[PDB]
Design an enzyme around this catalytic site. Structure first.
Site, PDB file in Angstrom:
ATOM      1  N   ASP A  95       1.859   9.076  12.034  1.00 15.06           N
ATOM      2  CA  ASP A  95       3.053   9.593  11.357  1.00 15.06           C
ATOM      3  C   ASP A  95       3.699  10.799  12.044  1.00 15.06           C
ATOM      4  O   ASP A  95       3.840  11.869  11.444  1.00 15.06           O
ATOM      5  CB  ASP A  95       2.725   9.908   9.886  1.00 15.06           C
ATOM      6  CG  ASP A  95       3.948   9.860   8.981  1.00 15.06           C
ATOM      7  OD1 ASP A  95       4.845   9.015   9.208  1.00 15.06           O
ATOM      8  OD2 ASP A  95       4.001  10.665   8.025  1.00 15.06           O
ATOM      9  N   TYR A 112      12.254   5.380   4.357  1.00  8.54           N
ATOM     10  CA  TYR A 112      11.826   5.035   5.747  1.00  8.54           C
ATOM     11  C   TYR A 112      11.489   3.548   5.881  1.00  8.54           C
ATOM     12  O   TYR A 112      11.861   2.898   6.866  1.00  8.54           O
ATOM     13  CB  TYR A 112      10.642   5.918   6.186  1.00  8.54           C
ATOM     14  CG  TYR A 112       9.295   5.575   5.570  1.00  8.54           C
ATOM     15  CD1 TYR A 112       8.988   5.930   4.256  1.00  8.54           C
ATOM     16  CD2 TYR A 112       8.324   4.903   6.313  1.00  8.54           C
ATOM     17  CE1 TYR A 112       7.748   5.610   3.693  1.00  8.54           C
ATOM     18  CE2 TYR A 112       7.087   4.580   5.763  1.00  8.54           C
ATOM     19  CZ  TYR A 112       6.804   4.935   4.457  1.00  8.54           C
ATOM     20  OH  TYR A 112       5.579   4.614   3.923  1.00  8.54           O
ATOM     21  N   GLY A 113      10.794   3.023   4.874  1.00  9.30           N
ATOM     22  CA  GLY A 113      10.335   1.635   4.856  1.00  9.30           C
ATOM     23  C   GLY A 113       9.137   1.478   3.940  1.00  9.30           C
ATOM     24  O   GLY A 113       8.683   2.450   3.323  1.00  9.30           O
ATOM     25  N   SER A 114       8.624   0.255   3.849  1.00 10.63           N
ATOM     26  CA  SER A 114       7.452  -0.033   3.020  1.00 10.63           C
ATOM     27  C   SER A 114       6.324  -0.659   3.836  1.00 10.63           C
ATOM     28  O   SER A 114       6.570  -1.370   4.817  1.00 10.63           O
ATOM     29  CB  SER A 114       7.821  -0.925   1.832  1.00 10.63           C
ATOM     30  OG  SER A 114       8.551  -2.066   2.246  1.00 10.63           O
ATOM     31  N   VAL A 115       5.092  -0.382   3.420  1.00 11.07           N
ATOM     32  CA  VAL A 115       3.904  -0.824   4.141  1.00 11.07           C
ATOM     33  C   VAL A 115       3.055  -1.764   3.281  1.00 11.07           C
ATOM     34  O   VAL A 115       2.835  -1.509   2.092  1.00 11.07           O
ATOM     35  CB  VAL A 115       3.049   0.387   4.621  1.00 11.07           C
ATOM     36  CG1 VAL A 115       1.834  -0.076   5.427  1.00 11.07           C
ATOM     37  CG2 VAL A 115       3.894   1.363   5.452  1.00 11.07           C
ATOM     38  N   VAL A 165       0.812  -1.224   0.000  1.00 12.92           N
ATOM     39  CA  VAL A 165       0.000   0.000   0.000  1.00 12.92           C
ATOM     40  C   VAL A 165       0.846   1.276   0.000  1.00 12.92           C
ATOM     41  O   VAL A 165       0.322   2.374  -0.204  1.00 12.92           O
ATOM     42  CB  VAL A 165      -1.038   0.052   1.173  1.00 12.92           C
ATOM     43  CG1 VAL A 165      -2.170  -0.947   0.947  1.00 12.92           C
ATOM     44  CG2 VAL A 165      -0.371  -0.182   2.521  1.00 12.92           C
ATOM     45  N   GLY A 166       2.149   1.132   0.222  1.00 11.67           N
ATOM     46  CA  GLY A 166       3.045   2.285   0.290  1.00 11.67           C
ATOM     47  C   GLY A 166       4.497   1.920   0.526  1.00 11.67           C
ATOM     48  O   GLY A 166       4.826   0.773   0.843  1.00 11.67           O
ATOM     49  N   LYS A 186       4.446  -2.648   8.455  1.00 12.08           N
ATOM     50  CA  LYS A 186       5.542  -1.840   7.939  1.00 12.08           C
ATOM     51  C   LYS A 186       6.884  -2.518   8.175  1.00 12.08           C
ATOM     52  O   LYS A 186       7.252  -2.801   9.313  1.00 12.08           O
ATOM     53  CB  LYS A 186       5.508  -0.460   8.601  1.00 12.08           C
ATOM     54  CG  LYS A 186       6.582   0.532   8.196  1.00 12.08           C
ATOM     55  CD  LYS A 186       6.263   1.873   8.877  1.00 12.08           C
ATOM     56  CE  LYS A 186       7.487   2.734   9.112  1.00 12.08           C
ATOM     57  NZ  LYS A 186       7.128   4.027   9.781  1.00 12.08           N
TER      58      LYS A 186
HETATM   59  C1  LIG Z   1       1.684   6.196   6.475  1.00 13.29           C
HETATM   60  C2  LIG Z   1       2.261   5.234   7.480  1.00 13.29           C
HETATM   61  O1  LIG Z   1       3.546   5.425   7.862  1.00 13.29           O
HETATM   62  N1  LIG Z   1       3.929   4.425   8.817  1.00 13.29           N
HETATM   63  C3  LIG Z   1       2.850   3.607   9.007  1.00 13.29           C
HETATM   64  C4  LIG Z   1       2.876   2.442   9.942  1.00 13.29           C
HETATM   65  C5  LIG Z   1       3.359   2.626  11.237  1.00 13.29           C
HETATM   66  C6  LIG Z   1       3.400   1.554  12.127  1.00 13.29           C
HETATM   67  C7  LIG Z   1       2.963   0.297  11.719  1.00 13.29           C
HETATM   68  C8  LIG Z   1       2.479   0.110  10.422  1.00 13.29           C
HETATM   69  C9  LIG Z   1       2.439   1.181   9.532  1.00 13.29           C
HETATM   70  C10 LIG Z   1       1.766   4.044   8.215  1.00 13.29           C
HETATM   71  C11 LIG Z   1       0.392   3.472   8.086  1.00 13.29           C
HETATM   72  C12 LIG Z   1      -0.388   3.206   9.207  1.00 13.29           C
HETATM   73  C13 LIG Z   1      -1.663   2.678   9.035  1.00 13.29           C
HETATM   74  N2  LIG Z   1      -2.118   2.434   7.802  1.00 13.29           N
HETATM   75  C14 LIG Z   1      -1.357   2.703   6.714  1.00 13.29           C
HETATM   76  N3  LIG Z   1      -1.847   2.454   5.473  1.00 13.29           N
HETATM   77  N4  LIG Z   1      -0.111   3.216   6.855  1.00 13.29           N
END
Ligand SMILES: Cc1onc(-c2ccccc2)c1-c1ccnc(N)n1
EC number: 2.7.11.24
Length: 344
Positions: free
Chosen positions: A162, A29-32, A27-28, A47
């Site tokens: 965030d 420092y790192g990746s999510v 869906v999206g 993440k």
């Molecule tokens: C933006 C973003 O940047 N960091 C996180 C994150 C932080 C801790 C755990 C997991 C995701 C998120 C995030 C949070 C919830 N939903 C989504 N889609 N993204």
């Protein structure tokens, strides 16, 4: 004990996660990734931090984020559902995964070039301030409050996500990354504090009321001019507090302007909303309304409950002024992963 982890390449990254998490979708420092947590029945965001220990700066940032998320326990703030590593020991520890509730839509998705009702604005801003009271009580400053950092579900329930960050390039030009920043932080006027977040709330509230960006500056200088047109140029009192001699000299070059009438700016808005805006959007940060004070403002009469606006447990952040090696930050981070206790 240790769960069973499974491997999967998502895009071009190897993800190793416990079996409970299924249907991993980027869906999206790192990746999510979005996922389904079969243990809790929750739709989760997972993440994976990218090279969490590649430098002292990155290792300290990793520890910072994990410490922050482990502390935050409030309805209107991001919570940590889980944190894990496939590593079986400190020796092989190299990856950190963080888990929270999946954000479905943000505030931007709800504003969408249109005005909101006054009851909606009340409820939305009340929640931001409720969350902020909690964050500030732990001596934490968000630093980066904007609509895209605020998750809102279908019942209008809001979470602050965030925490703050942003480089010189991404703060350049006609960009939302800068439109919500307090002027003292935007132009590094002085050692700033928690009140920077109240400025951001003011910019957010105005945009919900009008459906338009309050200060859509095309650059730093343009945005400052937009700000001073509204709130007036600073007086002698504030000028002294601008410790940056250079920033103070530039400010003094500007033709003096009086504060505008907010009732004429925000035509048709609840007079109580206008009043609160006047108290949030004060140039001198010393004089801005605080979250705790704003919660008691008449505008939130239908939502305010002093017995249901909790503060945070003490937050020890002495690590911030501590100088350590990568392996030392890494061991601290590992300790925090191992000691994690999930919420009920
Ligand atoms: C933006 C973003 O940047 N960091 C996180 C994150 C932080 C801790 C755990 C997991 C995701 C998120 C995030 C949070 C919830 N939903 C989504 N889609 N993204």
């Amino acid at each position: 004990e240790r769960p069973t982890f499974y491997r999967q390449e998502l895009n071009k990254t190897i993800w190793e996660v416990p079996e409970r998490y299924q249907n991993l979708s980027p869906v999206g420092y790192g990746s999510v990734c979005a996922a389904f947590d079969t243990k809790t029945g929750l739709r989760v965001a997972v993440k994976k931090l990218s090279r969490p220990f590649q430098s002292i700066i990155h290792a300290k940032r990793t520890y910072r984020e994990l410490r922050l998320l482990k502390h935050m326990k409030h309805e209107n703030v991001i919570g940590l559902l889980d944190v894990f590593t496939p590593a079986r020991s400190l020796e092989e520890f190299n990856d950190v995964y963080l888990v929270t509730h999946l954000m479905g839509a943000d505030l931007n998705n709800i504003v969408k070039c249109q005005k909101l009702t006054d009851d909606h604005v009340q409820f939305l801003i009340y929640q931001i301030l409720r969350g902020l009271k909690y964050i500030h009580s732990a001596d934490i400053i968000h630093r980066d409050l904007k609509p895209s950092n605020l998750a809102v579900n279908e019942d209008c329930e809001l979470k602050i996500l965030d925490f703050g960050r942003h480089t010189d390039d991404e703060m350049t030009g006609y960009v939302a990354t800068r439109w919500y920043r307090a002027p003292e932080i935007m132009l590094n006027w002085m050692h700033y504090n928690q009140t920077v977040d109240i400025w951001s709330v003011g910019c957010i509230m105005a945009e919900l009321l009008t459906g338009r960006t309050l200060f859509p500056g095309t650059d730093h200088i343009d945005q400052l001019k937009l700000i001073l047109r509204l709130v007036g140029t600073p007086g002698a009192e504030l000028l002294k507090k601008i410790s940056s001699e250079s920033a103070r000299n530039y400010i003094q070059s500007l033709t003096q302007m009086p504060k505008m009438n907010f009732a004429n700016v925000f035509i048709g808005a609840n007079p109580l909303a206008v009043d609160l805006l006047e108290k949030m959007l004060v140039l001198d940060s010393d004089k801005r309304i605080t979250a705790a004070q704003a919660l008691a403002h008449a505008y939130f009469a239908q939502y305010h409950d002093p017995d249901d606006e909790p503060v945070a447990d003490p937050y020890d952040q002495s690590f911030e002024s501590r100088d350590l090696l990568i392996d030392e930050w890494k061991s601290l981070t590992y300790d925090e992963v191992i000691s994690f206790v999930p919420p009920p």
